[PDB]
Design a protein around this ligand. Structure first.
Ligand SMILES: CCCCCCCCCCCCCCCCCC(=O)OC[C@H](CO[C@@H]1O[C@H](CO[C@H]2O[C@H](CO)[C@H](O)[C@H](O)[C@H]2O)[C@H](O)[C@H](O)[C@H]1O)OC(=O)CCCCCCCCCCCCCCCCC
Ligand code: CLA
Ligand code: CLA
Ligand code: CLA
Ligand code: CLA
Ligand code: CLA
Ligand code: CLA
Ligand SMILES: CC1=C(/C=C/C(C)=C/C=C/C(C)=C/C=C/C=C(C)/C=C/C=C(C)/C=C/C2=C(C)CCCC2(C)C)C(C)(C)CCC1
Ligand SMILES: CC1=C(/C=C/C(C)=C/C=C/C(C)=C/C=C/C=C(C)/C=C/C=C(C)/C=C/C2=C(C)CCCC2(C)C)C(C)(C)CCC1
Ligand SMILES: CC1=C(/C=C/C(C)=C/C=C/C(C)=C/C=C/C=C(C)/C=C/C=C(C)/C=C/C2=C(C)CCCC2(C)C)C(C)(C)CCC1
Ligand SMILES: CC1=C(/C=C/C(C)=C/C=C/C(C)=C/C=C/C=C(C)/C=C/C=C(C)/C=C/C2=C(C)CCCC2(C)C)C(C)(C)CCC1
Ligand SMILES: CCCCCCCCCCCCCCCCCC(=O)O
Ligand SMILES: [Cl-]
Ligand SMILES: [Cl-]
Ligand SMILES: [Fe+2]
Lengths: 341, 34, 451, 82, 30, 37, 334, 36, 62
């Protein structure tokens, strides 16, 4: 048997941690994305790219550490360690934001590896690959938000930085500049995520409260044998209950579990499409008819106009420090402010 | 009996050993004064 | 050897205290030992507070929740709420801490060495949950103990030195209460007050005579009810309406405690009589009113006619009318015009704030208190950065009123969940399907289809 | 079933395990401690110590504003701290 | 100082596990 | 501040309030000792 | 049999197409009242002086809104927490101006949804079920109480309750972030874990059961026809699904017990949403998110900004602009 | 092979994480990051 | 009595720490059923006495 068939044998051994052909891509890239984040949040600054401290070493805590995006002046440089910016100098690579592209790009290939892993294992064990299919939604989000979005903008600077508070800043940037809450693709995404959590809770609670008495203990967990043939809960009682409480109910267990796949996967795919639009500043920012009316009628006020005033506050108060390379100087007198505050 | 060096062994030590190192770095940082 | 594993008791370790349901003696131990933990905390915590207490800072700048309760009862405090003797705080602290040891001892005794069940050692201490006569007898005794406790507060107020009275002339003082309110039109009128704005149900109690009088009523009511229940057994209608089991009784009490937690949450947030702002800091409404007062004072000192000053909206910048016409402070604090407090009420006339009193009679002590309370509003971060969320680090402050309201909302909420959890379980178990649906007699299967 | 590796419950309760790791764990910890206490992590990664974010009298941030001259820009900001 | 605090809470903290440990040696009624 | 007589016990008083949570933790040390039976 | 007992049998009958029940006796009128008022108000209510400053906000479709911008607007700040039933107004016109529909709707709705929860307990008892579905619903229910009831209580006004509209919700969220830094609060961070994880585990579970459906159909027909309502046998192979998922991660990171798996699905989102509801309810009393503003300073004392300071700049823009005409004094203390 | 009881190793492991965490929370109040 | 009020108190502290560990262990080793029941009796009475002693001495050092 050829050397290829023997390597195949070893890669597909049943061991504690399955490896597979997909592992040659997955494990190096996943470990290095993870490792680069831990390394950067622990030891690396964002002083030269953002004017920010960003590491434990500098006195940040778990919420405020980040591996921050490269400076706007880097454009969309791959920021290779050996490329023209760092010129092989590791220390200068860190200071210029190289760990961001390092993590983003190894993370991208690591996600590819994870999906291939899902295909590989599904094939060997003999199951259908719906789990791989479902993981397309996390991938579409990661690609749309961390890659496509900055590629449409001026630079990687405006991608999300890898940190807790840094992502919160990203959220508020999207409100203030993109009016992203008003975007129907985001709204569908919200529905799919909140709807998914809903399905998760309601399906778990329904099963747990239509169980059959299959043992005599008050702890009902032990009355389940993974190899039993019989359903462990009553589809029929569950159906009656929800039919009479809510008016409709599931009657088909296969549809129910396919729906649980469909809802959040579809939601995340919709949100990814909206962010591709925002890559180009193709926002759902305004309603023209409201703006025409409001411009002419100073007594016309809605919650839509109230929220644009907030956005306008976000943009002017956050821009000088958030986009330090623009050298925005906004004297006190130009800042938008309501009375007193 | 069992093996003691496995793929698993490498996986755990690939994570475990940098984790301890990093923790000692972070502990030391709590005593940095400005 | 009894219960103590899953195979024999029916409950896994993570539900292990359910193994105690029919082991009255070990169960007695658990309750007493847990009472030890409560009394311990009251003791240890008071000593901690006392060790960390600086008498010249306000109590509410020091993270104190228990010393304020002791001070409110008239101990260690003088006029204005100044602390004059810390020894009583020490005594309260030490006596609870000592007492927890004896409770601890008796609880560990009953839980470990004492008899696992009591019903054979004596028919008085032993009980069956289904014995409705015995359960009301225990309820009866505990009602009497509660009525006694309410009358101890009365004893403290009327005979043993009085209570701190934030409303007392001259900035507040300890005061013996000699004429408690007994008129039930006042006392039970509080219970029929609406809980909405300007009314506030029982949270609106604003004088210590009503407070002492209500505890006279409640002490006597609890004592009379205790005797009632010792001597009676539940009527047929009550028998048919309730579930009679250990778990059901638990669930009834969890519902009660939940209700009480939500009430306490609102008490500490709104009421500045039994939670004096001298000790707990201003209420949210109080601090917001104090701001308008502060800048009214400043601007009037500069020469502004504050009564005729039209603000940007057309409403008064400083003063406006509430929707029933009372004169009140303007701006966003218009929502808080139901606020009443001793620093403000001297400016109040029959139509609300009196402009003649505002122009002429504001004393320096009112300006000081308004400035103090404005700058100790109960707003702050979880890491105790005082102020609005956009404030910079500097002031290390979160109001005791926030700590006490937030904690007890969370507690009250989870105890409502516990009520629903145990109440539903007690119903299911009494009817026999708490462990699941019987495959051989699934009730839905014997029902006509819906359509 | 089981994939043949030694059970973790077995290794971590074993004395050979704690013999090896009573040394190795604390040794790694001290190494990480020393990495920072020596000041070495500052120089590996280029992270300012508390005294080297700004020059004494300057209030501007040393932002890199050029792509290909950026490494040289950073080196120039570092010399202006001496 | 903070020494005494930590020495105190070190001793209190060990007290719990000791009880368990002692009863396990003496094959007590855990 | 405590009375000066008791000041030597200040560090002990500082740590007493955490004791009740050690009980909750002790329950788990105990159940591990009995294997969560 | 007497009228009362026939009525009681009907109320609690398990044969009604929709269960009524004693909780339903209150739920039905209160939900109808709230639903009818909401629909009429959303379409046709005139502008409402939400902030009490005689600046009416138009919320209804006939007064120039669309579905996204329309709302039933919260009642006037001048009212605060006072009860404002229709009969307390001099006229319907006054009641509409001051935002009375909002109180009527939210009170009937909270009452009706609490009884919805009790009704879930009640039917589960009549059917011989276990009783805790209602506990799962307590998580969304508590969330509704927080934004319509608790947060107004703590802040002193229903005018700061959540508006009944799409853009009004966004307004509520933005102002909340400015005044409480909710993103930096761990109970909201727990809520996000709850809902992201809930969606994750929803898709995981659906995909693993779908992956391991037993072949019962041909390629022409829907695989859904291989399951028959009421069938005694399971339609998928959980051992196979465990075999796939155990290898994807490792064996013990995978569930073999269906009951444990489904309890986990119930528990994760419910707990997370309990925490986020408790987040709103405790920020209602101004115990706000973590404040790391100017937490890092250098050897001289210069402030070294972190990402927390950048969040604070956005927060400040929200703060200084919201309700731009409503503040006369420099601190926005509620 | 099992010489050392699991419950002992768990408690010791447990108390070791408490201390490291505790230290990190101490550090939020002292030195870098304390605002002081 | 100063230094000796502090000696009563640290006596009390010490005895408490011994009672805290010893009482539960005693109670759950019914091997030492009778041997030990005399000791807790002594310990308990001695504890109550130290508390009383510390309580009166307080009013000579407070
Ligand atoms: C089973 C039983 C079923 C019970 C249901 C029965 C239906 C009625 C329930 C209605 C309660 C909600 C109304 C909101 C009340 C609110 O404004 O409450 C505030 C009032 C206090 O009101 C304030 O009381 C104040 C009293 O202070 C006054 O007097 C003080 C005296 O010192 C000071 O001087 C102060 O300045 C002065 O203003 C003023 O009157 C304020 O205007 C007034 O707003 O609280 C109080 O009445 C206490 C209210 C308890 C809290 C409400 C319960 C919260 C429920 C949480 C739901 C959780 C659900 C989870 C879902 C799962
Ligand atoms: C911890 C307190 C406590 C508890 C748990 C009980 C429990 C009990 N009592 Mg006792 N009771 C108590 C204190 C208590 N009592 C005191 C202090 C007194 C003296 C006043 C009495 C006087 C008393 C009498 C006279 C009777 C009972 C009875 C009963 C039984 C039925 C109660 C019932 O139906 O619930 C409540 C259920 C109801 C249906 C009550 C009415 C429901 C409405 C909606 C409540 C609204 C009115 C409310 C009473 C006040 C409004 C306040 C509101 C603003 C919050 C039950 C064993 C009955 C029994 O069987 O006696 C042997 C009985 O007849 N009790
Ligand atoms: C699957 C593993 C894997 C993958 C996919 C990547 C992928 C990447 N790494 Mg990472 N890396 C890895 C492992 C991996 N790395 C490991 C193990 C380490 C530690 C040693 C690193 C350390 C590391 C650093 C330090 C950096 C990267 C960088 C990069 C990026 C640029 C790589 C590049 O240009 O390669 C160029 C090389 C190739 C594409 C391989 C060419 C292969 C041959 C020569 C083709 C010849 C064809 C031949 C004629 C036909 C033969 C046929 C056959 C039958 C024989 C890319 C995202 C850079 C980065 O992230 O910058 C932002 C960077 O700076 N990597
Ligand atoms: C307030 C907290 C509290 C209290 C009072 C109790 C009390 C009790 N539990 Mg519960 N339990 C708790 C929390 C609590 N538990 C938690 C958090 C869990 C989950 C981990 C459990 C899980 C659980 C299970 C699984 C079981 C119990 C059982 C029991 C009972 C017998 C235990 C036994 O034999 O111990 C034996 C243990 C020992 C002898 C070890 C020493 C323990 C002592 C008490 C230490 C005391 C130290 C203290 C400092 C002494 C100072 C004395 C001083 C005053 C002089 C007892 C009444 C058992 C039961 O119901 O029996 C039928 C049982 O099976 N519990
Ligand atoms: C009703 C409960 C309650 C309330 C309102 C307070 C409130 C307060 N305590 Mg106290 N405390 C309590 C119970 C309570 N404590 C208990 C049980 C203990 C024993 C562990 C202590 C031990 C204690 C100490 C040792 C100290 C305080 C201090 C304080 C103040 C600052 C708290 C802080 O920074 O929190 C920080 C917030 C957290 C740690 C977050 C808690 C969230 C938990 C982990 C989860 C909540 C959900 C859960 C299901 C319940 C504040 C006035 C400090 C002070 O100023 O002293 C004067 C102080 O040093 N308290
Ligand atoms: C509500 C709590 C409670 C209850 C119902 C019981 C019930 C019982 N205990 Mg336990 N016990 C408790 C608490 C409790 N005990 C505590 C706290 C301790 C530690 C001091 C003990 C220690 C203990 C032991 C060592 C023994 C019992 C025994 C008994 C049984 C008979 C007791 C008897 O008849 O004495 C009658 C009671 C008296 C003669 C004294 C009555 C006067 C009381 C104590 C004064 C009231 C104090 C006041 C209300 C509290 C505030 C004071 C404050 C200023 C400090 C009975 C099952 C016995 C047993 O199980 O037999 C094997 C036994 O030997 N108990
Ligand atoms: C007076 C209060 C009270 C009492 C006496 C009981 C008693 C009981 N309950 Mg109920 N319960 C209560 C309140 C109460 N409960 C509340 C408020 C809730 C809602 C949260 C519940 C929810 C609940 C559930 C879901 C279940 C019970 C069960 C049980 C039984 C076993 C419990 C046990 O051994 O837990 C053992 C203890 C543990 C496993 C430890 C739990 C640790 C928690 C999570 C700590 C979290 C808070 C803590 C402060 C964290 C701070 C963080 C810091 C950083 C027992 C009959 C079980 C049952 O039905 O039995 C029949 C069961 O399944 N209870
Ligand atoms: C980047 C880079 C690289 C690599 C690196 C790596 C690979 C690293 C790794 C690293 C690592 C691998 C690290 C780790 C660390 C860890 C840590 C830092 C941890 C910590 C943790 C903690 C702290 C936690 C704990 C806890 C808590 C907190 C609570 C709950 C519980 C518990 C216990 C879990 C190289 C060479 C290529 C070069 C270039 C660049
Ligand atoms: C049963 C059980 C349990 C529980 C237990 C409990 C809960 C207990 C309690 C106990 C207790 C509750 C105890 C107590 C104790 C106390 C003490 C022991 C005290 C003492 C005191 C003193 C010693 C003092 C002194 C002093 C003074 C006098 C002054 C100042 C200073 C000082 C503080 C030093 C558990 C869960 C674990 C497990 C199972 C079983
Ligand atoms: C002290 C005081 C006072 C007074 C107080 C009083 C006099 C009170 C009373 C109280 C009361 C007098 C209360 C009561 C309550 C009641 C309740 C809370 C009820 C409940 C009910 C229930 C829960 C029922 C249920 C049911 C039904 C309905 C049907 C069938 C089934 C059952 C039975 C379950 C005042 C404010 C002046 C001031 C301050 C202090
Ligand atoms: C008052 C007083 C006193 C008393 C004291 C006492 C009462 C004590 C107690 C103590 C205690 C009471 C303690 C305990 C401790 C405990 C602990 C230290 C635990 C921990 C735990 C852990 C670490 C866990 C782990 C684990 C396991 C076991 C299993 C599962 C998993 C885990 C990992 C969770 C004295 C004498 C000082 C004198 C002075 C005064
Ligand atoms: C596909 C897998 C890719 C793995 C890549 C590993 C890369 C590690 C090598 C780093 C070498 C940097 C030194 C070169 C500097 C040259 C700069 C210059 O010529 O100006
Ligand atoms: Cl606004
Ligand atoms: Cl204002
Ligand atoms: Fe399922």
């Amino acid at each position: 048997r050829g050397w290829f068939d023997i390597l195949d044998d070893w890669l597909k051994r049943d061991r504690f941690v399955f490896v597979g052909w997909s592992g040659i891509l997955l494990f190096p890239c996943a470990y290095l994305a993870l490792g680069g984040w831990l390394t950067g949040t622990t030891f690396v600054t964002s002083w030269y790219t953002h004017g920010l401290a960003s590491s434990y070493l500098e006195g940040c805590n778990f919420l405020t550490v980040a591996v921050s995006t490269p400076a706007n002046s880097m454009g969309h440089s791959l920021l290779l360690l050996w490329g023209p910016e760092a010129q092989g100098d590791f220390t200068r690579w860190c200071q210029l934001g190289g760990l961001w592209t390092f993590i983003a790009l190894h993370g991208a290939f690591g996600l590819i590896g994870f999906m291939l892993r899902q295909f590989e294992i599904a094939r060997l064990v003999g199951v259908r690959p719906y789990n791989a299919i479902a993981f397309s939604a996390p991938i579409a989000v990661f690609v749309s938000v961390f890659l496509i979005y900055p590629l449409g903008q001026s630079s990687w600077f405006f991608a999300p930085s890898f940190g807790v508070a840094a992502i919160f800043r990203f959220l508020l940037f999207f409100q203030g500049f993109h009016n992203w809450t008003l975007n129907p693709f985001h709204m569908m995404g919200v529905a799919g995520v909140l709807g998914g959590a809903l399905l998760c809770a309601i399906h778990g609670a329904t099963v747990e409260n239509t169980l059959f008495q299959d043992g005599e203990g008050a702890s009902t967990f032990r009355a389940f044998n993974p190899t039993q043939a019989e359903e462990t809960y009553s589809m029929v009682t569950a159906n009656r209950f929800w039919s009479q409480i809510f008016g409709i109910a599931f009657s088909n267990k296969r549809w129910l579990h396919f729906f649980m796949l469909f809802v959040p996967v579809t939601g995340l795919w919709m949100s990814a499409i909206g962010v591709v639009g925002l890559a180009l500043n193709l926002r759902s920012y305004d309603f023209i008819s409201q703006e025409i009316r409001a411009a002419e009628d100073p007594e016309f006020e809605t919650f839509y106009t109230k929220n644009l005033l907030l956005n306008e506050g976000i943009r002017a108060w956050m821009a000088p420090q958030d986009q330090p390379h623009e050298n925005f100087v906004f004297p006190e007198e130009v800042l938008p402010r309501g009375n007193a505050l | 009996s069992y093996p003691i060096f496995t793929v698993r062994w490498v996986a755990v030590h690939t994570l475990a050993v940098p984790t301890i190192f990093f923790l000692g770095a972070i502990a030391a940082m709590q005593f940095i004064q400005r | 050897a009894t219960n103590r594993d899953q195979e024999s008791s029916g409950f896994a370790w993570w539900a292990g205290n359910a193994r105690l349901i029919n082991l009255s003696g070990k169960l007695l131990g658990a309750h007493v030992a847990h009472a030890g933990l409560i009394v311990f905390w009251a003791g240890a915590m008071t000593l901690f507070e006392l060790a960390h207490f600086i008498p010249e800072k306000p109590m509410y700048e020091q993270g104190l929740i228990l010393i304020p309760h002791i001070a409110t009862l008239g101990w260690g405090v003088g006029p204005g709420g100044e602390v004059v003797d810390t020894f009583p705080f020490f005594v309260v602290g030490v006596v609870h801490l000592i007492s927890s040891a004896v409770l601890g001892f008796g609880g560990v005794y009953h839980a470990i060495r004492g008899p696992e069940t009591l019903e054979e050692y004596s028919s008085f201490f032993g009980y069956d949950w289904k014995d409705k006569n015995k359960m009301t007898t225990i309820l009866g005794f505990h009602l009497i103990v509660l009525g006694i406790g309410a009358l101890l507060l009365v004893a403290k107020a009327m005979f043993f030195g009085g209570l701190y009275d934030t409303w007392a002339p001259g900035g507040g003082d300890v005061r013996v209460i000699t004429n408690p309110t007994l008129d039930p039109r006042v006392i039970f009128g509080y219970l029929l007050k609406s809980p909405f704005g300007g009314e506030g149900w029982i949270v609106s109690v604003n004088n210590l005579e009503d407070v002492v009088g209500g505890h006279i009523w409640i002490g006597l009511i609890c004592i009379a009810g205790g005797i009632w229940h010792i001597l009676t057994t539940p009527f047929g209608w009550a028998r048919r309406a309730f579930i009679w089991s250990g778990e059901a009784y638990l669930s009834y009490s969890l519902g009660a405690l939940s209700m009480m937690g939500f009430i306490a949450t609102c008490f500490v947030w709104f009421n500045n009589t039994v939670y004096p702002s001298e000790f707990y800091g201003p209420t949210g409404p109080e601090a917001s009113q104090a701001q308008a007062m502060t800048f009214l004072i400043r601007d009037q000192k500069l020469g502004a006619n504050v009564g005729s000053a039209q603000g940007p909206t057309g409403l008064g910048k400083y003063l406006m009318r509430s929707p029933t016409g009372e004169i009140i402070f303007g701006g966003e604090t218009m929502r808080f015009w139901d606020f009443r407090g001793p620093w403000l009420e001297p400016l109040r006339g029959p139509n609300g704030l009196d402009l003649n009193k505002i122009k002429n009679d504001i004393q320096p002590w009112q300006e000081r208190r308004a400035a103090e309370y404005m700058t100790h509003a109960p707003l702050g971060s979880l890491n105790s950065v005082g102020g609005v969320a956009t404030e910079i680090n500097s002031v290390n402050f979160v109001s005791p009123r926030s700590w006490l309201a937030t904690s007890h909302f969370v507690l009250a909420f989870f105890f409502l969940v516990g009520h629903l959890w145990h109440a539903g379980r007690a119903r299911a178990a009494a009817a026999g399907f708490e462990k699941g649906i019987d495959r051989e007699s699934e009730p839905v299967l014997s029902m006509p289809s819906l359509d | 079933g089981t994939t043949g590796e030694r059970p973790f419950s077995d290794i971590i309760t074993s004395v050979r395990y704690w013999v090896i790791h009573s040394i190795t764990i604390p040794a790694l910890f001290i190494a990480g401690w020393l990495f920072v206490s020596t000041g070495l992590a500052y120089d590996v990664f280029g992270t300012p110590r508390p005294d080297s974010y700004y020059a004494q009298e300057q209030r501007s941030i040393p932002l890199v504003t050029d792509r290909f001259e950026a490494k040289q820009q950073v080196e120039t900001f570092l010399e202006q701290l001496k | 100082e903070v020494i005494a605090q930590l020495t105190m809470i070190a001793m209190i903290g060990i007290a719990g596990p000791m009880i368990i440990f002692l009863l396990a040696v003496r094959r007590g009624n855990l | 501040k405590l009375p000066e007589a008791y000041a030597i016990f200040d560090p002990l008083v500082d740590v007493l309030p955490v004791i009740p949570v050690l009980f909750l933790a002790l329950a788990f040390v105990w159940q591990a000792a009995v294997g969560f039976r | 049999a007497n009228l009362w007992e026939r009525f009681c049998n009907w109320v609690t009958s398990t044969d009604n197409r929709l269960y009524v029940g004693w909780f339903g006796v209150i739920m039905i009128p209160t939900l109808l009242a709230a639903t009818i008022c909401f629909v009429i108000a959303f379409i046709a209510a005139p502008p409402v002086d939400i902030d009490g400053i005689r600046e009416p906000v138009s919320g209804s479709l006939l007064y120039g809104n669309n579905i996204i911008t329309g709302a039933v607007v919260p009642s006037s700040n001048a009212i605060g927490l006072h009860f404002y039933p229709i009969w307390e107004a001099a006229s319907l016109d006054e009641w509409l101006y001051n935002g009375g529909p909002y109180q009527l709707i939210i009170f009937h709705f909270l009452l009706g949804a609490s009884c919805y929860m009790g009704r879930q307990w009640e039917l589960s008892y009549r059917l011989g079920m276990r009783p805790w579905i209602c506990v799962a619903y307590s998580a969304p229910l508590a969330s509704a109480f927080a934004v319509f009831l608790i947060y107004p209580i703590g802040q002193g006004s229903f005018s700061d309750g959540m508006p009944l509209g799409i853009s009004g919700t966004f307004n509520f969220m933005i102002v909340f972030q400015a005044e409480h830094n909710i993103l930096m609060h761990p109970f909201h961070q727990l809520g996000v874990a709850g809902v992201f994880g809930g969606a994750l585990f929803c898709a995981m579970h659906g995909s693993l059961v779908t992956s391991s459906l037993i072949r019962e159909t041909t390629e022409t027909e829907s695989a859904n026809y291989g399951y028959k309502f009421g069938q005694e046998e399971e339609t998928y192979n959980i051992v196979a699904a465990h075999g796939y998922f155990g290898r994807l991660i490792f064996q013990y990171a995978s569930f073999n017990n269906s009951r444990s798996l489904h309890f986990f699905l119930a528990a994760w989102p419910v707990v997370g949403v309990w925490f986020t509801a408790l987040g709103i309810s405790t920020m209602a009393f101004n115990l706000n998110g973590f404040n790391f503003n100017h937490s890092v300073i250098d050897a001289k004392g210069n402030v070294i900004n972190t990402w927390a300071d950048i969040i604070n700049r956005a927060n400040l823009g929200m703060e200084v602009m919201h309700e731009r005409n409503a503040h006369n004094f420099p601190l926005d203390l509620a | 092979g099992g010489r050392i009881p699991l419950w002992i190793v768990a408690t010791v492991a447990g108390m070791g994480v408490i201390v490291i965490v505790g230290l990190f929370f101490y550090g939020a109040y002292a030195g870098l990051g304390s605002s002081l | 009595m100063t230094i000796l009020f502090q000696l009563a108190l640290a006596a009390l502290v010490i005895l408490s720490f011994v009672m805290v560990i010893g009482v539960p262990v005693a109670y759950a080793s019914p091997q030492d059923w009778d041997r030990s029941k005399q000791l807790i009796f002594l310990g308990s009475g001695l504890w109550i006495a130290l508390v009383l002693v510390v309580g009166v001495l307080n009013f000579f050092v407070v």
